[PDB]
Design a protein around this ligand. Structure first.
Ligand SMILES: Nc1ncnc2c1ncn2[C@@H]1O[C@H](COP(=O)(O)O)[C@@H](O)[C@H]1O
Ligand SMILES: Nc1ncnc2c1ncn2[C@@H]1O[C@H](COP(=O)(O)O)[C@@H](O)[C@H]1O
Lengths: 267, 264
């Protein structure tokens, strides 16, 4: 009606920037409507860098409590594009394993079990759409010890199942198959889940590294070495991460059903 | 900073609605301040937008046979907007209601190539038809349009789109797959080469085309395809194999299709 256009300019003119939240293709800011309380997150993406599938993940998972609702989104071919989303938490799983722990953050085995069940279930829900998250890692799993609610975030590297893969994302989370340029598949996400599970359970990275120069093929020798036992977690928890990170996919929990039926995740 | 919001709002404020484009989602012709180039602004109803429509636009940005998207505004509690190129005042349907074989061969090669490029993303258009193929008669240029029913390969299917373009496999509720698009291409190819619908129903009787159930298409595919009189034997062989009921007798893949003598 031509009021829509100016309403878009009117609505998205209410938002005011409070701070920069992140540390690049994108930058994330704390936002707020003038005179209104609720805090949002406004993500500004550079021109000619947007992964259109990031929009789909928000929409497809709108009704899943472990994904982040998208309130507004403006894409411009010849400029910046905006995503205005909920602010869900100040913390993430990396905060609970990092070396600088001034706030006495810890995740015991029970907390890891619950997080992993939620993560696996949430990623499975996404996978029903034949989309993979493709950058699952501690920094993209928001969590705080008051809500204790897990939010999967940053769908900017999401991909359609079956398409040719390339070396996007974080190398040290690459599955053997992604290193070998196999098509995007759910097993990519499940391997990253395995690394996350090892990290929150042990507070250490599974494989033998200290790193800007680490390359995908450098990971393969490391995957061939024994996975260290996590000393102070259960035998079931150890058996879980071993089978999550088996080099041979034919010995690995590489599917939803395999993962969710393992003793560790059962009660 | 906040300057980015101002600029983002500013860019979209340059567009002005000129007129609506139907007597029938609503599509409008739009103009931009400082451009003679026209655009198409498509306002989609809240709650019913297929997110993948946006992806097809973006993924096919550099393909000349898809429509370029310039802006997209989404509001979870409002109306969403797509601002895209205005490419043509008509489509292959309007244009068929006298294409010679050579002209049809070019259109088919272009369409098959364009759709193959889309299929590299494991996306299927899923509503290929004459009315969704815009055609600039001046430049003989083809544009695939209306990605509102696009789907990802391997997801379960339902009876969306246009029944009379449904493949045997879509009628049988197989998962979405490239062959859905290729069957529709076969119908398009038959239509432009012959000016007629291949199967034994009155395509000018609207009520009947709209009412026919998917299951009732399958007996029609059993019948032999009428020969197209004044086109090549190669052309006739092409449409015959594009629309073979038995998929083992059908050109159901890009490599199969593009290697047929008619397209060589
Ligand atoms: N919905 C959100 N709510 C709260 N913090 C967020 C949110 N999204 C991103 N952040 C923070 O901003 C950082 C960079 O954004 P991103 O990588 O896109 O998640 C994240 O690692 C979080 O620290
Ligand atoms: N770029 C365009 N140029 C001219 N007519 C269009 C254009 N886009 C859409 N239309 C008309 O609007 C319908 C649907 O809009 P669309 O979203 O572009 O598929 C088409 O089937 C045409 O009738």
């Amino acid at each position: 009606p031509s009021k829509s256009i100016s309403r878009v300019a009117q609505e998205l003119s209410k938002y005011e920037i409070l701070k920069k939240l992140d540390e690049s293709y994108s930058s994330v800011y704390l936002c707020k409507k003038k005179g209104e309380h609720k805090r949002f997150v406004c993500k500004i993406v550079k021109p000619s860098t947007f992964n259109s599938l990031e929009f789909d993940v928000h929409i497809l998972m709108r009704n899943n409590p472990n994904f982040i609702k998208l309130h507004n989104f403006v894409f411009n071919d010849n400029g910046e594009s905006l995503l205005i989303m909920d602010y869900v938490s100040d913390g993430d799983l990396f905060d609970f394993v990092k070396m600088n722990d001034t706030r006495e953050l810890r995740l015991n085995e029970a907390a890891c079990k619950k997080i992993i069940i939620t993560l696996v279930t949430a990623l499975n829900d996404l996978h029903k759409n034949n989309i993979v998250h493709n950058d699952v890692k501690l920094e993209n799993l928001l969590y705080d010890r008051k809500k204790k609610r897990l939010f999967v975030c940053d769908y900017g590297l999401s991909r359609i199942v079956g398409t040719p893969s390339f070396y996007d994302g974080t190398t040290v989370y690459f599955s053997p198959e992604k290193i070998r340029h196999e098509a995007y598949q759910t097993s990519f996400d499940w391997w990253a889940v395995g690394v996350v599970a090892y990290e929150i359970l042990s507070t250490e990275y599974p494989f033998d590294i200290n790193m800007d120069a680490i390359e995908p093929k450098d990971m393969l020798p490391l995957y061939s070495k024994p996975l260290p036992t996590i000393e102070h977690v259960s035998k079931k928890a150890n058996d879980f991460v071993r089978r999550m990170l088996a080099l041979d996919i034919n010995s690995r929990l590489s599917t939803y059903d395999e993962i969710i039926k393992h003793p560790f995740l059962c009660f």
